[PDB]
Amino acid sequence: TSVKPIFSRDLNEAKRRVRELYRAWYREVPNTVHLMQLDITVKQGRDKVREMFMKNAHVTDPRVVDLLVIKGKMELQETIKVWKQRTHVMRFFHETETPRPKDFLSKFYMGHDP
Template identity: 55%
Template sequence: MLYQYDVPITKKEAEEKLKERFRENAHVTDVRVVDILIMKGQMELDEVMEHWMGNMHVMKFFKDTQPEKPSDFLSKFYQGVE
């Protein structure tokens, strides 16, 4: 599935992000909340599988794992950003 999107993410990184998303909700014990989280996850998976999400939508899941872009002039200059 990952190969169908033009994203700079490896299969290993995608698997780790999926595990991380599960661990974020490991503390939830209320059955109703668990059901809602399962439904939300299923909807997101369906959107990705049916290509209703674009590349940028898929990349939002990896936003915290991507290095921040430089904001000041010197950092941009050193990295060759215009």
């Protein structure tokens, strides 16, 4: 315990920042899908944003959250100030890779080490 605060004194204040970033991404998804001529649906993309913002829903510690948005903000900057081209963005969608089943029987049938 006894940790020093990075930018947010408590999960509460930190959550404020997450809200802002969500908004940012939400407002940006449409633009990217147009400035990058990505073949995705704005709605679809906006769900992806939600996915990511929740993939890390479990974090309880304020410090971890604060870094997470710093990093998140940095990603947005790379996508609104466009330095990240389609190949970079579409990677988020994991479009080419073949999905792996998580069913035990499925894995048994395919991989030595699951």
